[PDB]
Amino acid sequence: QYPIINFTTAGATVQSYTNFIRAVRGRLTTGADVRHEIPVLPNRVGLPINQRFILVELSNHAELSVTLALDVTNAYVVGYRAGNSAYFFHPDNQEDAEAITHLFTDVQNRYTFAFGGNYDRLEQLAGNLRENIELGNGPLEEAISALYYYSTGGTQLPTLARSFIICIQMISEAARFQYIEGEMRTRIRYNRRSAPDPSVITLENSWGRLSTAIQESNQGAFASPIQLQRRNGSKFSVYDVSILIPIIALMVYRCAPPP
Numbered sequence: 292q293y294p295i296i297n298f299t300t301a302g303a304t305v306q307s308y309t310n311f312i313r314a315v316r317g318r319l320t321t322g323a324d325v326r327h328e329i330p331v332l333p334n335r336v337g338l339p340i341n342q343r344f345i346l347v348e349l350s351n352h353a354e355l356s357v358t359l360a361l362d363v364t365n366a367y368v369v370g371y372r373a374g375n376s377a378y379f380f381h382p383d384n385q386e387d388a389e390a391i392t393h394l395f396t397d398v399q400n401r402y403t404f405a406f407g408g409n410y411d412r413l414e415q416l417a418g419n420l421r422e423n424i425e426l427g428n429g430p431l432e433e434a435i436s437a438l439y440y441y442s443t444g445g446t447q448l449p450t451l452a453r454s455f456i457i458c459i460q461m462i463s464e465a466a467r468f469q470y471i472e473g474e475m476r477t478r479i480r481y482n483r484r485s486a487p488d489p490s491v492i493t494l495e496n497s498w499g500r501l502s503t504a505i506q507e508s509n510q511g512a513f514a515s516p517i518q519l520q521r522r523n524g525s526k527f528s529v530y531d532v533s534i535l536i537p538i539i540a541l542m543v544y545r546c547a548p549p550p
């Protein structure tokens with residue numbers, strides 16, 4: 292039922308990754324909602340269940356496959372399937388708990404993790420922060436294998452958590468931010484794995500706030516500036532949507548657009 296987008300780390304290139312992220316964005320957004328040249332994800336309110344999710348099927352050089360499920364309203368990775376087992380993060384609310392019952396319905400073994408899927412919880416379980424977790428094609432290749440082998444006892448919980456952290460940033464954050472997509476393209480182009488710098492981290496941390504600030508802005512002008520960081524960790528202020536047009540690719544729905 293739900294749309295499937297395929298990506299493989301096997302022989303991945305800048306172009307194949309770019310095609311993938313574009314396809315993901317295309318399935319996340321309808322084109323109904325564009326504000327200051329920035330697309331907005333579907334409003335959760337009244338969104339029919341048959342339109343709630345997309346599936347991202349990840350394959351690797353090891354000839355393994357996992358399927359991530361993403362909530363279209365926020366690009367949130369709600370869980371995954373590997374073969375005969377599916378695993379879901381502890382849902383944040385009753386609506387999201389009901390929604391996941393519509394995913395991977397013909398899978399033999401369904402599990403809900405006792406932990407939620409936010410970075411803070413996943414970093415705790417990984418024993419490492421995002422700033423110390425390497426990203427790139429190699430990390431993603433390894434993450435796919437780690438997710439695949441979890442059900443059979445091959446993958447320790449910290450490795451699983453780290454693997455989620457990799458997938459979320461390389462798929463969902465890249466979909467949300469052209470800037471983060473660009474940073475992943477760079478890693479792929481040179482086949483060089485590296486942890487995300489502060490510019491990446493602060494963007495990830497600020498997505499909800501940036502979405503709200505843009506949508507609540509007066510003709511694009513923020514009431515309150517938002518502090519982001521450069522690659523070197525130095526702070527700069529965002530006062531307006533204009534500077535964010537090349538940086539943010541999609542926003543979570545926060546309010547109705549003004550007349």
Ligand SMILES: Nc1nc2nc(C(=O)N[C@@H](Cc3ccccc3)C(=O)O)cnc2c(=O)[nH]1
Binds near residue numbers: 384
């Ligand atoms: N489907 C599903 N969705 C979730 N969304 C969230 C969450 O933090 N949502 C933010 C918006 C957001 C900000 C950054 C990154 C992603 C989303 C919010 O409510 O304002 C947490 N948890 C979940 C979950 O467990 N399942």
